[PDB]
Amino acid sequence: MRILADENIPVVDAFFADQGSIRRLPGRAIDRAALAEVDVLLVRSVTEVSRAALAGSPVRFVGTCTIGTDHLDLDYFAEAGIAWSSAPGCNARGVVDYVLGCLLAMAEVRGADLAERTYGVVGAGQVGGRLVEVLRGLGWKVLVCDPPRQAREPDGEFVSLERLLAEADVISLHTPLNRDGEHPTRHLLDEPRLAALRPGTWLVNASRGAVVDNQALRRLLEGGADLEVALDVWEGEPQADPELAARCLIATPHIAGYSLEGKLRGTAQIYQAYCAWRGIAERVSLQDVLPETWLAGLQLNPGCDPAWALATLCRAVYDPRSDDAAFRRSLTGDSATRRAAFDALRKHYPPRREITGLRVATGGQAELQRVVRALGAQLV
Amino acid sequence: MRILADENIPVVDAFFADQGSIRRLPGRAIDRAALAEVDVLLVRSVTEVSRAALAGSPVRFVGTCTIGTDHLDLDYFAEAGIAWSSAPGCNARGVVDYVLGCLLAMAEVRGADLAERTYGVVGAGQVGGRLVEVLRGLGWKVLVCDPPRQAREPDGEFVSLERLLAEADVISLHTPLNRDGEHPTRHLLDEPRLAALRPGTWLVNASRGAVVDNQALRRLLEGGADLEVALDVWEGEPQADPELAARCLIATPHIAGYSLEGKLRGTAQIYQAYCAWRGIAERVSLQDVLPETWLAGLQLNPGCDPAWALATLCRAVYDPRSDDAAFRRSLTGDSATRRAAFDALRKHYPPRREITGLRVATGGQAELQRVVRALGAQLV
Ligand SMILES: NC(=O)c1ccc[n+]([C@@H]2O[C@H](COP(=O)([O-])OP(=O)(O)OC[C@H]3O[C@@H](n4cnc5c(N)ncnc54)[C@H](O)[C@@H]3O)[C@@H](O)[C@H]2O)c1
Ligand SMILES: NC(=O)c1ccc[n+]([C@@H]2O[C@H](COP(=O)([O-])OP(=O)(O)OC[C@H]3O[C@@H](n4cnc5c(N)ncnc54)[C@H](O)[C@@H]3O)[C@@H](O)[C@H]2O)c1
């Protein structure tokens, strides 16, 4: 089999070596001429995989993470007999860890009990759906806004955006950025909705920048709004609003998803679908390819306060306050240097693991076991 | 014996029930009237154990674990044949953990490598000497200023203040507050010394308030001085200068030494001293009253980044950023409110353990074992 991968995609050889020959090219340097001897194509959201792009090539499999099934010509793939993988939630778990870390920072500045908060998750797909089950696993109140999922799941309990805004004191956004369609999400949080946020409400946005009206948010905070704000995604990336950032509790350069696992999981998931398509057993796993974690595990004694355990567990793996500190330093120069620094932070992002990889002994304590399980960490 | 103790002194029964009667009183309510029926006196800093208070009473032993020995009339004790104990170092290690947490916070904001700093420790007694041992154990560059110790230990490695202040870019202060003598420490850090600090220098003061000129510090920081500052001790306590505090990376209500085991060790050391004075064998020990840790331990894999391990281990036990958050909130009301809120945080300080009680597995990696031993954590 003859493989072509976008050069940015890691660990292609480890997964696909015994599968045939691998060739690697830049994303936009992959066109009609390159595809002439390609059986399996592995791309990101840069390379074109449309009818125009693919017709006349021996391409039988298209694998990606960055592109959703809304932006793949699946009717064409069916027509041409091309298999596909749009690996769901390649970098999803990392975002869940980031939100948890933000909530911990927020609870700490405020002296708040996280368990008494009312959570509102807008968008409950790969990321939001994972967040929801952590929060609920801990026994916390979660309101879920997801109109599409509501229409397909008549038995589930969903709420409207305006009820969520009415009842939630913690909001986390996890929708795509849709300008059009049935349920548009650009400035889903506009000035009137942001201005109506009750004093002491918390907001996390690690979806896409333009889901929140950044300029309205900045002015609302400058005006003295009583809020806690964590933003991982900004309206003009790599040019984040520096006066908005200065008013955010947590401000990071679109790195929420940037776990070590999340960068390699994309390749692993494509390979799994590729094995499922070919009807072959998997020869190499994500585990096989991941380096050993730095923190194997942690032991709690059964007297440990559950809330204390939660904060200790999450922060031992990842505290976004460290990324926040690096981001503040990136905002010191002129527009041009801030932009370059934004992208450099993302490129040189340090090795960061996921909470699901942490092994936790609890000494058999039930409330501690509940915390480990809700987090998705491993009981040992 | 007939024991009287400040009602806030813990575990007096466990250590003293076998010795006779035990009475308690609030600290400030202890005077010569109250001392008529007392052989063994156990106090805190809030009560004067003076010539006027002790004359005619049968008090033969005095024990204390608190801030300094200024409330004790040590000359009179030597005169009157009164045995005593200040339980030296009872609360020392909590301050060490506090300083480490400050350095971690400071490195994170500045993006600094802790291993590249030059550390100056001014005062190397119970606290400073412990700090020095940690810093040296990690292989870091350390300067020690302690003129009393140097004069008595002339073959030691000591340096003048002037030179320490010129060479060090991280200064931590651990002297007493002395107005007079050959080496007075009131405003040891004054306008000209503070002004001549190399740009980007970190200053930690968890000794006593008036060792640093708070007003001069505040004006320098307002004037744009390139410095990081961590203060646990303030001129005017409980009335911290809020404009100063706002410019400190870390600001806390004099709680550096408020670890749970410090309070227990105080009584336990006093008992050990009491047993020597009475010439009896020690029966009760700290282990008899010490609660189990909440966090038993952490397991590191051999490939763990040493610098990451240091930060993770320290913070897993205690991060003073949490106390800083609670302290920021205490600074919101009027003068009377801030003063009372300062004391409320000290009186109701949450349970907090010591880094020395942490058990760490390292997979036999030498660089990691070095970090664990330097920290004084338990290698397993
Ligand atoms: N910051 C990061 O590092 C990072 C990392 C990964 C993903 N993301 C972003 O997170 C967002 C969600 O990612 P995902 O993988 O979970 O996507 P997903 O498509 O799996 O889930 C999105 C959910 O949003 C719902 N939704 C759509 N419109 C909505 C609306 N108007 N109101 C409420 N819900 C709506 C959809 O039904 C879906 O369930 C995306 O914007 C993605 O780009 C960010
Ligand atoms: N913030 C807290 O919670 C907390 C807790 C414990 C102690 N403290 C304070 O920390 C300081 C030290 O405590 P300790 O128990 O280590 O006291 P200690 O007496 O054991 O040590 C003080 C050291 O300072 C040295 N010294 C004296 N004058 C000096 C000078 N001019 N320059 C340099 N060094 C000098 C002395 O020789 C001595 O070695 C005290 O002020 C104490 O009150 C604060």
Question: Does ligand 2 lie within 6 Å of residue B67's CB atom?
Answer: yes
Say if CB B122 and CB B145 are below 8 A apart: yes
Q: Quick check: is B348 catalytic?
A: no
* Residue B27 identity (one-letter amino acid): G
CA atoms of B220 and B236, how far apart (whole Å) = 19
**Together in a domain, B301 and B376:** yes
Q: What angle do CA A289, A292, A297 make, to 5 degrees?
A: 135
3-state class of B170 per DSSP?
strand
For residues A247 and A13, is the Cβ–Cβ distance under 8 A?
no
Claim to verify: residue B203 and residue B310 sit in the same structural domain:
no
Q: Let me know: does A155 contact A134? Beta carbons within 8 Å.
A: no
Which residues of A are documented as binding site for NAD(+)? 126-127, 146, 175, 206-208, 232, 257
Distance CA A234, CA A287 (A): 33
Note whether B222 and B131 are same-domain residues.
yes
Residue whose entry in the numeric block shows the structure tokens 């520096």 = A242
- Specify the CATH number for the domain of residue A332: 3.30.1370.170
Measured distance CA(A369)–CA(B181) in Å, rounded: 59
Using CA atoms, how far apart are residues B367 and A76, in angstroms rounded to an integer?
57
Instruction: Give the active site residue among B7, B167, B237, B367.
Output: B237
Question: To test the ligand 1 pocket, which listed residue (A66, A71, A122, A127) has its Cβ within 8 A of the most ligand atoms?
Answer: A127
Residue B146: count other Cβ atoms within 10 Å of its Cβ: 24
Domain count, chain A: 3
Q: B86 and B133: one domain?
A: no
Query: What's CA A313's distance to the chain center, in Å?
Result: 20
Displacement of CA B345 from its chain's centroid (Å): 16
Among A264, A268, A251, smallest CA distance to A353 is for: A264
Strands A295-300, B295-300: pairing is antiparallel
Ligand nearest to the CA of A149: 1
The answer to whether residues A91 and A262 touch, using CB atoms and an 8 Å cutoff, is: yes
Helix axes A260-278, A92-110, angle to 10 degrees: 150
- In angstroms, what CA-CA distances link B370 with A294, B113, B230, B361? 16, 17, 27, 12
Flag if A325 and B301 touch (Cβ within 8 Å): no
Number of H helices, E strands in chain B: 15, 14
Is B307 in a helix, a strand, or coil? helix
Element housing B325 (H / E): helix B321-330
Same domain? For B324 and B279 the reply is: no
What tokens does A106 get? 């927020």
How many CB atoms are closer than 10 A to CB B57?
18
Tokens standing for residue B370:
């070095």
Which residue's CA is minimally distant from atom 19 of ligand 2? Answer: B125
How open is the CA angle B104-B291-B358, to the nearest 5 degrees? 35
Q: Can you read off the two tokens belonging to residue A91?
A: 């970098």
- CA dist A346 and A351 (Å) reads 12
The answer to whether A205 touches A230, Cβ cutoff 8 Å, is yes
Q: Which two tokens stand for residue A110?
A: 């405020």
A202: Cα within 13 Å, side-chain hemisphere: 24
DSSP characters over B223-238: TT--EEEEES--TTTT
Q: Say yes or no: CB of residue B99 within 6 Å of ligand 2.
A: no
- The three-class DSSP label of residue B63 is strand
Length, in residues, of chain A:
380
Q: How far is A300 from chain B (nearest CA, A)?
A: 5
* Domain with A317 in it: 293-380
**What is the C-alpha to C-alpha distance for residues A329 and A322, in angstroms, rounded to an integer?**
11
Binding site per annotation, positions of B for NAD(+): 126-127, 146, 175, 206-208, 232, 257
Q: What is the Cα–Cα distance from B293 to A229, expressed in whole angstroms?
A: 34
Q: Which residues of B are annotated as a binding site for substrate?
A: 45, 66, 258
Residues A174, A207 contacting (CB under 8 angstroms): yes
Residue B299, helix vs strand vs coil: strand
Q: Quick check: A374 and A138 in contact, CB under 8 A? A: yes
Same domain, A253 and A282: no
Taking CA atoms, what residue in B is nearest to A305?
Answer: B294
Q: Report how far residue A362's alpha carbon sits from residue A380's, in angstroms, rounded to the nearest whole number.
A: 8
- Bridge partners (DSSP) listed for residue A359: A297, A378
**Pocket residue to mutate for ligand 1, from A69, A131, A133, A174, most atoms within 8 A of Cβ:** A174
Check CB contact under 8 Å for A321 and B108. Answer: yes
- B351-360: burial string, b at 16+ Cβ within 10 Å, e else: ebbbbbbbbb
A227 bridge partner residues = A201
Distance B146 CA to ligand 2 centre (A): 10
**Torsion angles phi and psi, residue B111, rounded to 5:** 65, 35
- Do A127 and A66 share a structural domain? no
Burial class (CB in 10 A: 0-12, 13-18, 19+), A26: exposed
B232 & B314 share domain: no
Compute the distance between CA of residue A22 and CA of residue B185 in angstroms, rounded to an integer: 71
A111 plus A241 within the same structural domain: yes
* Beta strand extents in B45-199 (DSSP E only): 61-64, 83-85, 118-122, 141-145, 170-173
> In angstroms, how far is the first alpha carbon of chain A from the final one?
42
Looking at the structure, tell me whether residues B109 and B248 fall in a common domain.
Answer: yes
**Catalytic sites of A, residue numbers:** 208, 237, 254
Look up the CATH number of the domain holding residue A171. Answer: 3.40.50.720
φ and ψ of B272, to 5 deg: -60, -40
Q: What angle do CA A324, A123, A254 make, to 5 degrees?
A: 25
With an 8 Å Cβ cutoff, are A298 and B316 in contact? yes
Closest chain B C-alpha to A154 CA, distance in angstroms: 44
What tokens were used for B46? 């809030």
Distance, CA of B184 to CA of B187 (rounded, Å): 9
Determine if ligand 1 sits within 6 Å of the CB of residue A266: no
8 A C-beta contact, residue B313 and residue B295 = no
Q: How many residues does chain B have?
A: 380
A36, A37, A39, A40: CA torsion to nearest 10: -90
CB half-sphere exposure, B305, CA atoms < 13 A = 9
Which atom of ligand 1 is the closest one to the Cα of A232?
1
Tell me how the structure was determined: X-ray
Write the CB contacts of B336 (distance below 8 Å, at least 6 apart in sequence): none
Residue where a domain stops, chosen among B244, B277, B292: B292
Q: Are residues B66 and B125 in the same domain?
A: no
- Amino acid making up residue B230: A
Q: Are residues B236 and B102 in the same domain?
A: yes
What distance in Å separates the CA atoms of residue B9 and residue B273, rounded to the nearest whole number?
A: 16
Of B257, B279, B303, the domain-final residue: B257
Active site residue B359: no
Q: Annotate chain A with three-state secondary structure.
A: CEEEEECCCCCHHHHHHHHCEEEEECHHHCCCCHHHHCCEEECCCCCCCCHHHHCCCCCCEEEECCCCCCCCCHHHHHHHCCEEEECCCCCHHHHHHHHHHHHHHHHHHHCCCHHHCEEEEECCCHHHHHHHHHHHHCCCEEEEECHHHHHHCCCCCCCCHHHHHHHCCEEEECCCCCCCCCCCCCCCECHHHHHCCCCCEEEEECCCHHHECHHHHHHHHHCCCCEEEEECCCCCCCCCCHHHHCCCCEECCCCCCCCHHHHHHHHHHHHHHHHHHHCCCCCCCHHHHCCCCCEEEEEECCCCCHHHHHHHHHHHHCCCHHHHHHHHHCCCCCHHHHHHHHHHHHHCCCCCCCHHHCEEECCCCHHHHHHHHHHCCEEC
Check: CB of residue A302 under 8 Å from CB of residue A368.
yes
What separation in Å is there between the alpha carbon of B207 and the centre of ligand 2?
Answer: 6
Check the CA dihedral B104-B108-B110-B111 and report its sign.
positive
Separation CA A118–CA A38 (nearest Å):
51
Ligand 1 and A165: CB distance under 6 A: no
